[PDB]
Write a protein that binds this DNA or RNA. Structure first.
Ligand SMILES: [Mg+2]
Ligand SMILES: [Mg+2]
Ligand SMILES: [Mg+2]
Ligand SMILES: [Mg+2]
Ligand SMILES: [Mg+2]
Ligand SMILES: [Mg+2]
Ligand SMILES: [Mg+2]
Ligand SMILES: [Mg+2]
Ligand SMILES: [Mg+2]
Ligand SMILES: [Mg+2]
Ligand SMILES: [Mg+2]
Ligand SMILES: [Mg+2]
Ligand SMILES: [Mg+2]
Ligand SMILES: [Mg+2]
Ligand SMILES: [Mg+2]
Ligand SMILES: [Mg+2]
Ligand SMILES: [Mg+2]
Ligand SMILES: [Mg+2]
Ligand SMILES: [Mg+2]
Ligand SMILES: [Mg+2]
Ligand SMILES: [Mg+2]
Ligand SMILES: [Mg+2]
Ligand SMILES: [Mg+2]
Ligand SMILES: [Mg+2]
Ligand SMILES: [Mg+2]
Ligand SMILES: [Mg+2]
Ligand SMILES: [Mg+2]
Ligand SMILES: [Mg+2]
Ligand SMILES: [Mg+2]
Ligand SMILES: [Mg+2]
Ligand SMILES: [Mg+2]
Ligand SMILES: [Mg+2]
Lengths: 106, 67, 96, 227
RNA sequence: ACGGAAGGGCACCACCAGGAGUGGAGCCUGCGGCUUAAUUUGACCAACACGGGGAAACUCACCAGGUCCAGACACAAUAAGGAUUGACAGAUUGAGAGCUCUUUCUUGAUUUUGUGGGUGGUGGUGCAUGGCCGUUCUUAGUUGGUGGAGUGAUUUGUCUGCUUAAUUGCGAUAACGAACGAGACCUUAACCUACUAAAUAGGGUUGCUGGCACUUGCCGGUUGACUCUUCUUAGAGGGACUAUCGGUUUCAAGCCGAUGGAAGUUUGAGGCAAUAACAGGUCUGUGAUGCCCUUAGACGUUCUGGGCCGCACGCGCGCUACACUGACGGAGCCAGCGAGUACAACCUUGGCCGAGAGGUCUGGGUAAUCUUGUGAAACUCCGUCGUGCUGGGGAUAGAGCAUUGUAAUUAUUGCUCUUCAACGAGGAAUUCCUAGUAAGCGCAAGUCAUCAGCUUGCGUUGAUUACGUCCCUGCCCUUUGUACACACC
């Protein structure tokens, strides 16, 4: 008796791209397989996590710096979909690196 | 300062020596041929290879050449 | 170290009961966590036991990893005078 | 647990650094190679790739268990929510960490420096590697410092091919007169390097053309018409 | 290796033509010297706004003092009629320190005093070491296998030429095949009316409204609906390869020009970046570390206060200025990098107070959602000033109001009123830089409880003059000479 739509939301994170895109594509394919209405894998600006650091551990040497960084890609998805199939989708197809989070928002 | 170092020249030479009947005068057709008949990893190297292949083909069309 | 015997008793009983400790290197802190006593003599008592040859220590990123060897188990069992058929939580076969 | 997502990823990275350095400290005698941290909806699986898997597990599977316990206290986890897993290295020759630790161990037993280094290089190229290199720096049988290089095959140095194929390892060895520094570099076979490109950037492969016969001039080979 | 020897090529850490400067002034900061109890220390192109070194406590390493053992373990030794521990109150102390004493009370084998040993050390040695980074060297340079020449150290391959940013190629050849470097490669910046899509981004139509017009239209508001992805995003891809053409080239590598392009400097900018080496720096980043030193009134650790900021003086990065292309008033109103609270208290809107700093009450934001369209400065328009060290310049001081802070004096910092100094475009000399570049202008992030005149990034306005050379300073290859090899110091 879970016919009430939860208008659920699936958001993602990672420091990589191919695995995150793969997980999103599998999520969309699973949603399409059971006739689910959705808003697509909307892309979010890749947040560049940057730290500048001096290379010399002792200050001696010509002034030389470096910039380490990652990017975080988010690609949230929301579904106007039934209950059990959505949750089963969330607990399946999980890849290390990409982090899945689910918000009911009902 | 474009000199087209060893790799592109040698690859184009082998491309001509093994596939002259299929190569043409046009850059784009030879680019597609380079894509399909040879596994160039990147695409900038692919474009350079196709360009030098076209240049060598034009030189051959003008006349016979060394090497 | 001068540890009052009841705090040392707590150290020993927790250590034998479950076998492992972390004991942040930061001294002078009020209470060590899941022990309700000062971290300082926790570290010192574990150092004394290691010097005896009962606890293997491993320092990495200030967290003083501690583990009990078999002679340590025997010594703790004799000190805590507990029956000789109970093993620390590590020995429990919590396998796959 | 609510925290900024960028900070959460930074914490995940520093936690992986935590685990890797702690396992390097502990399982060094085990020929430790690497650690993978997989996160499931319920369990935080921690796969340990090491050489002596059976000793890593220990008798009756107790050692792994106690190791697990330490983690549950190092990060304030909960029982069952985290679980270790020991796995044999796919090929101990290719991994730089295992070779560096093994030849550090061989140095610890007073084995000849040149002999150990050359044996390591020989084994690495026996494993199928496309090139190995070892730098041993320090007080090699002299008070003055000196660095010995033992290389075989070819090792690239520029471009992410440095990151993609050749893997490096740095270790310190304590002796009775000082510290020796060990750098080990291996350029794996690009054709066998899965999960990425399978060749160098300038590696060009040309498909050999197929040979055919042209003489058939008229050759109107009629098929059965269909409608 | 060097040559005030030759050949051929390069470099705004070289110059020519220039631009902006510094060096003159005041100040901030970093060194030296002096001074001091200490003014802790390491660096002297490749030291000097460097050690992330913007230190009031901590930091800390120095100084005057006061605590404690955080001396494991083994043995001996005392010792359960006390090995020992701790303390109210007073003297003592800076202390509400049982540190030391007066008295006494408490505590139970953990300890106490000796031996061995072990730890701790921002103690010494970077001329014992690792790791890292810097430099030689941003140049194009290295290397070994067979083969040739040498008795040999070595040499040829690695070169007569031309070309390239390139040991980049065309080639000639006792050289043939190869390896590292360069290139290739990744990140980033462009171009995508082609694909996928979007209430955490925008747009259209239409609602429901506001106003002005009265013609159906203009500028708005609404998280009401339908629809779309051009811009904003980010994935897969496309695109440029010197493409076409014309010159010039043993007609080959390649160069020059025009056209089409978005892009024709390797498309711009970077990230990695070879062999060999320095007695280059770092023990002061490391629980990296050998040796030496110390390890009890300690060079361990902690507490209080002071210093790292003193000042007859010299030097190095910079900041504000010397004004009219300006200062000061109003008004216009334009960004892109960021960042932001949990076991803590961050970014702050909005409403009230105060003249301001600021204060208070609420509300958002764990982030394309909220600060935020960061409504930033330079800039623009209209006025006051009018060549007067003047309304420039804002240093040095006096008084007061607040904020952070356990604590602000030796002014932390912000704000209000006043005194307003030197400074007239700065000698010798010297620094950086050829296109969204220099320069001007600010903002964000790292330091951060509070503090930048610093650095790392970002964007605004945006040029003059080259598009060359070996004259100065050097670099690469070749030839030559050398009585040099710790190599012209
Ligand atoms: Mg290469
Ligand atoms: Mg490269
Ligand atoms: Mg100069
Ligand atoms: Mg000049
Ligand atoms: Mg100036
Ligand atoms: Mg001056
Ligand atoms: Mg001066
Ligand atoms: Mg001084
Ligand atoms: Mg230089
Ligand atoms: Mg200060
Ligand atoms: Mg102090
Ligand atoms: Mg201090
Ligand atoms: Mg003192
Ligand atoms: Mg120390
Ligand atoms: Mg040195
Ligand atoms: Mg180099
Ligand atoms: Mg020979
Ligand atoms: Mg030679
Ligand atoms: Mg579009
Ligand atoms: Mg032509
Ligand atoms: Mg480039
Ligand atoms: Mg030391
Ligand atoms: Mg000290
Ligand atoms: Mg100072
Ligand atoms: Mg400087
Ligand atoms: Mg004025
Ligand atoms: Mg903006
Ligand atoms: Mg005046
Ligand atoms: Mg600074
Ligand atoms: Mg030039
Ligand atoms: Mg001589
Ligand atoms: Mg002389």
């Amino acid at each position: 008796q879970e016919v009430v739509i939860h208008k659920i939301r699936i958001n993602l994170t990672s420091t990589k791209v191919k695995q995150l895109e793969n997980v999103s594509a599998n999520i969309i394919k699973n949603a399409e397989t059971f006739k689910l209405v959705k808003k697509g894998p909307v892309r979010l600006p890749t947040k560049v996590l940057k730290i500048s650091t001096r290379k010399t551990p002792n200050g001696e040497g010509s002034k030389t710096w470096d910039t380490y960084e990652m990017r975080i890609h988010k690609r949230y998805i929301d579904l106007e979909a039934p209950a059990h199939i959505v949750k089963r989708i969330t607990q399946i197809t999980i890849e290390p690196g990409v982090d899945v989070e689910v918000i009911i928002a009902a | 300062g474009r000199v087209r170092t060893k790799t592109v020249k040698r690859a184009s030479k082998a491309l001509i020596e093994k596939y002259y009947p299929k190569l043409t005068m046009d850059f784009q057709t030879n680019k597609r041929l380079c894509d399909e008949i040879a596994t160039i990893q990147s695409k900038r190297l692919r474009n350079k290879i196709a360009g030098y292949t076209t240049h060598l083909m034009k030189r051959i069309q003008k006349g016979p050449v060394r090497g | 170290m001068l540890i009052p015997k009841e705090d040392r008793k707590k150290i020993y009983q927790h250590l034998f009961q479950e076998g492992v400790l972390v004991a942040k290197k930061d001294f002078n802190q009020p209470k060590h966590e899941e022990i309700d006593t000062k971290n300082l003599f926790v570290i010192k008592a574990l150092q004394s036991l290691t010097s005896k040859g009962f606890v293997k220590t491993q320092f990495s990123w200030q967290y003083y990893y501690y583990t009990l060897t078999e002679e340590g188990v025997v010594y703790l069992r004799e000190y805590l005078n507990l029956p000789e058929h109970i093993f620390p939580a590590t020995y429990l076969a919590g396998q796959s | 647990a609510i925290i900024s997502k960028k900070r959460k990823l930074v914490a995940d990275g520093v936690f992986y650094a935590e685990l890797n350095e702690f396992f390097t400290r502990e399982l060094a005698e085990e020929g430790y190679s690497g650690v993978e941290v997989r996160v499931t909806p319920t369990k935080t699986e921690i796969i340990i790739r090491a050489t002596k898997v059976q000793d890593v597990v220990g008798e009756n599977g107790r050692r792994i268990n106690e190791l697990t316990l330490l983690i549950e206290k190092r990060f304030k986890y909960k029982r069952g929510t985290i679980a270790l897993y020991a796995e044999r290295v796919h090929d101990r020759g290719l991994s730089a960490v295992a070779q560096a630790e093994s030849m550090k161990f061989k140095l610890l037993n007073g084995l000849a420096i040149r002999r150990a280094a050359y044996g390591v290089v020989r084994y690495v190229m026996e494993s199928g590697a496309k090139g190995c290199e070892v730098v041993i720096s320090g007080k090699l049988r002299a008070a003055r410092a000196k660095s010995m290089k033992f290389a075989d095959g070819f090792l690239i140095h520029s471009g992410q091919p440095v990151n993609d194929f050749i893997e490096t390892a740095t270790r310190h060895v304590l002796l009775r007169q000082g510290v020796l520094g060990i750098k080990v570099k291996i350029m794996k076979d690009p054709s066998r390097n899965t999960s990425g490109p399978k060749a160098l950037p300038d590696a060009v492969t040309i498909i050999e053309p197929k040979e055919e016969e042209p003489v058939l001039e008229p050759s109107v080979k009629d098929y059965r018409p269909t409608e």
